[PDB]
Design a protein around this ligand. Structure first.
Ligand SMILES: Cc1cc2nc3c(=O)[nH]c(=O)nc-3n(C[C@H](O)[C@H](O)[C@H](O)COP(=O)(O)OP(=O)(O)OC[C@H]3O[C@@H](n4cnc5c(N)ncnc54)[C@H](O)[C@@H]3O)c2cc1C
Ligand SMILES: Cc1cc2nc3c(=O)[nH]c(=O)nc-3n(C[C@H](O)[C@H](O)[C@H](O)COP(=O)(O)OP(=O)(O)OC[C@H]3O[C@@H](n4cnc5c(N)ncnc54)[C@H](O)[C@@H]3O)c2cc1C
Lengths: 472, 472
């Protein structure tokens, strides 16, 4: 109508979830989104669905299939001819997946009655929103509340400018049409290492340049050392304190200069991915505003209930503090929607799981052991290795471990971290119990189906107290 | 002779864990076991390690990889030759898995310091146990407590007796050296369809002949139905209501007659698996009278705590009442050792997960829906398909669903049931919520990572409450 209860600008996982939940709570909801995808029409779901979460998980699943037929089929007595990938077909499948899914979300807001404005939306004083359509149409809307879910973008570095051809960000990467001979990845983060894995399993030699002292500094210290080892055994070369000073591309490959034990220069990679960071988009989102503050780093100031400086305007997901993860932005969206309707809601930020979907998966919930040491919580810890799981052994999949950490005085579970088969699923079991204030004895006292990979969390909980059966 | 605090008869999953846990508690414990593994020596582990759990999953994983490369790799642009199999290698790999795990259990009891006696153990009157070594050397050992965990064996049927060549039970079906081109399975339960799925995938035209006309009674009906369709689509031809009348082992094949409303005989399979049930084993454990009562069906009579009629004697696993599962045996073992050393334990027989490790895998916990309706309880059901899941789509593993059954009055969760990818893990996350007293609304409020198969549980709980993001 001319009025709305809530207008959400940006339809990413925070944004379109914000929207469906606000409509489900009976508010007249609008949704503004400007992104048109790969088949010419607007494509909802954001970075995650279109150039993110679903694109990289899909290519990681296809490039794992390749690598199993290649390395271990023989251990199963399975013989194949020479196995070969068709990279246009693989990318076509992925694109068919983002097509299905884009479409799904679109039916979901129509069935749910949200009104979707296709254009750019910017917040005016008095919480009116001006929507500018492709041609330059301008339309302002009235609403009672605004929810800014504008998300983020690739950090951009001076020594290596992307041109979406020889040098690329995470989007260019996901759409290559052939495996590159040599691929450099700048940034050893979650995105860096996933994309690095994908093409190295298909055939690229891959070097992952990282400037920081440490490998994966936010993952538990024992889980990360184990991951460094295994990812390097599959030929990701991760050079850990490299600063790149410049790049040059004579016509079709890029020579990078960097400093790490020497002042070195890598023979001109055929592809370079730039995966140094993501950062918040505030591009034309606000007028000299409905007084919305930005912080020194570019994030929209919100409080702990994602409410800005302007009553009724909230900002959620990637433009705001916290982990830049899809489930953080979505739960920020439903929590926010509920505060606008049937108030009683706050998000627990101390229990959002983090997953990298590599060979094996790395995942963790709660606090890491090194963080527990900096504000001296005496911890007890139990660990159980998938080499000791008869289930993982049957699946020919024995790498990694489960790590359970507990309070040494009346052992409430403080962290569950794991690198292994199904890391996402077992950490979610760790997380569901943490939510009910579990101890390791609760976990240990439970009936876990056999054989199941789950048994290795049951056994890491038995082990906090030193009474695991299949190890000691 | 030597004098003990606990003597355990049988080293299957219940009894070898019972012996470890008594050792862990301070009791001089003795293990007795007479199974010789096909290699030569006494092999600990029982029906599950040697000839049940780990064998069937091991074959089930190689056959699905075969099944996958045949018709699945194409979808990712994987240009193979065309998938061939060497079954002699495929069983050799399972035989190593078993050798390594049997070896593992042996090193575990030794480390926990259990005395093993390789022989048959018979309980004599007045708590003393005799062990006969390989050659008739008798020994009577003294103890203040006894745990009989002797086991189960297959139900042999008169129309069709085993000879481990042409007519076989599940042990023999686990050791075939070639793929029968036509296979008959009598019994469409867990065992039956897992061994039929193994060889079907590898090429056997398989028929499952079932005496009841109710497919998978103890499994939630929505799920059993779904399961019957998806399994009939992979080529299992399951005939319900079929009784087999007679067997003609010729020299080539097994001609099997049967009546299924009409009396007919399906052609002459190359091999017949007799998979109708498993019965308890009590053979020579009674002296004349030990004092232990046997039950009318063959079991040993024990109370709710696995105590028999004879005060220092307990009986755990498949020789006793309950779902004949390895995790049920293990847990009763642990519980009996704890109340032996100081009564600090009790187990919940209402939350014991059960899984069929088929092609979608099938798991469930709590009450099935038909049982709830049958005893008049008011329920609300949230159901969520893997077809609408982000991760399943990327994995190309989209079949099936998650069903959360909660009580309509208190919103407490009654049963979790799922046919689909990682069913067993998703039910164990459900068993965990359920152990703590969850409402469907508690799980609906939790943060589940994106993308994840665990999210299909989240959205199922949210769907019990009418308000689930990605469907309705
Ligand atoms: C390669 C990669 C892999 C990732 N993998 C995962 C993963 O597996 N799991 C995970 O949790 N996270 C992952 N992430 C993070 C994840 O995708 C983001 O955290 C998530 O997308 C945050 O969503 P959002 O709603 O805040 O913003 P976004 O998804 O960025 O969506 C914001 C939307 O608002 C729109 N927009 C912006 N301004 C306007 C405007 N002014 N008017 C109209 N429309 C506008 C944009 O077009 C955009 O579509 C990944 C990210 C990448 C790049
Ligand atoms: C094909 C198949 C697949 C299965 N899959 C699964 C699965 O996936 N998950 C699951 O939970 N269950 C599974 N089961 C069942 C599992 O094998 C049993 O539930 C489990 O073995 C029962 O343990 P138990 O300790 O009671 O007995 P058992 O494992 O049978 O162990 C009994 C032991 O007692 C010993 N014994 C008997 N008499 C004496 C004697 N007098 N003296 C000394 N020793 C003796 C035997 O040699 C034997 O090793 C499967 C079974 C089959 C047949």
């Amino acid at each position: 109508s001319q009025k709305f209860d809530v207008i959400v600008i940006g339809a990413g996982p925070g944004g379109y979830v914000a929207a469906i939940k606000s409509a489900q709570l009976g508010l007249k909801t609008a949704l503004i989104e400007k992104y048109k995808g790969k088949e010419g029409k607007t494509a909802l779901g954001g970075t995650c669905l279109n150039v993110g979460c679903i694109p990289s998980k899909a290519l990681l699943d296809s490039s794992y299939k390749f690598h199993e037929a290649h390395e271990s089929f023989k251990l199963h007595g399975i013989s194949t001819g020479e196995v070969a990938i068709d990279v246009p077909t693989m990318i076509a499948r992925k694109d068919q997946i983002v097509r299905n899914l884009t479409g799904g979300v679109a039916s979901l807001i129509k069935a749910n009655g949200v009104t979707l404005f296709e254009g750019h939306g910017k917040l005016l004083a008095g919480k009116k929103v001006e929507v500018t359509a492709a041609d330059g149409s301008s339309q302002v809307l009235d609403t009672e509340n605004v929810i800014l879910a504008s998300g983020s973008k690739p950090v951009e570095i001076p020594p290596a400018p992307v041109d979406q051809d020889v040098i690329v960000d995470s989007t260019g990467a996901l759409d290559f049409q052939n495996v590159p001979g040599k691929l450099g990845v700048i940034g050893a983060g979650v995105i860096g290492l996933e994309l690095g894995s994908v093409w190295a399993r298909l055939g690229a030699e891959v070097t992952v340049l990282e400037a920081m002292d440490k490998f994966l500094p936010a993952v538990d210290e024992q889980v990360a050392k184990e991951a460094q080892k295994i990812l390097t055994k599959q030929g990701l070369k991760i050079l850990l304190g490299a600063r790149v000073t410049g790049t040059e591309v004579k016509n079709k490959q890029v020579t990078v200069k960097f400093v790490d034990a020497e002042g070195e220069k890598s023979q001109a990679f055929d592809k370079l991915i730039v995966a140094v960071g993501r950062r918040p988009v505030t591009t034309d989102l606000l007028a000299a505003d409905s007084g919305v503050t930005l912080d020194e780093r570019g994030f929209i100031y919100v409080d702990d209930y994602c409410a800005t400086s302007v009553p009724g305007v909230y900002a959620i997901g990637d433009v705001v503090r916290g982990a830049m993860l899809a489930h953080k932005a979505s739960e920020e969206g439903v929590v926010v929607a509920e505060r606008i309707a049937g108030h009683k809601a706050q998000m627990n930020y101390d229990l959002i799981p983090a997953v990298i979907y590599t060979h094996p998966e790395i995942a963790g919930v709660g606090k890491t052991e090194q963080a527990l040491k900096a504000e001296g919580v005496a911890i007890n810890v139990g660990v159980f290795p998938f080499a000791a799981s008869g289930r993982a052994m049957a699946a020919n999949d024995t790498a990694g471990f489960v790590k359970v950490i507990a309070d040494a005085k009346t052992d409430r579970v403080l962290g569950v971290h794991v690198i292994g088969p199904s890391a996402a699923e077992l950490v979610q079991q760790g997380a569901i119990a943490m939510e009910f204030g579990t101890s390791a004895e609760d976990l240990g006292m439970m009936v876990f189906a056999h054989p199941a990979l789950s048994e290795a969390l049951h056994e890491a909980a038995l082990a906090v107290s030193g009474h695991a059966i299949h190890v000691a």
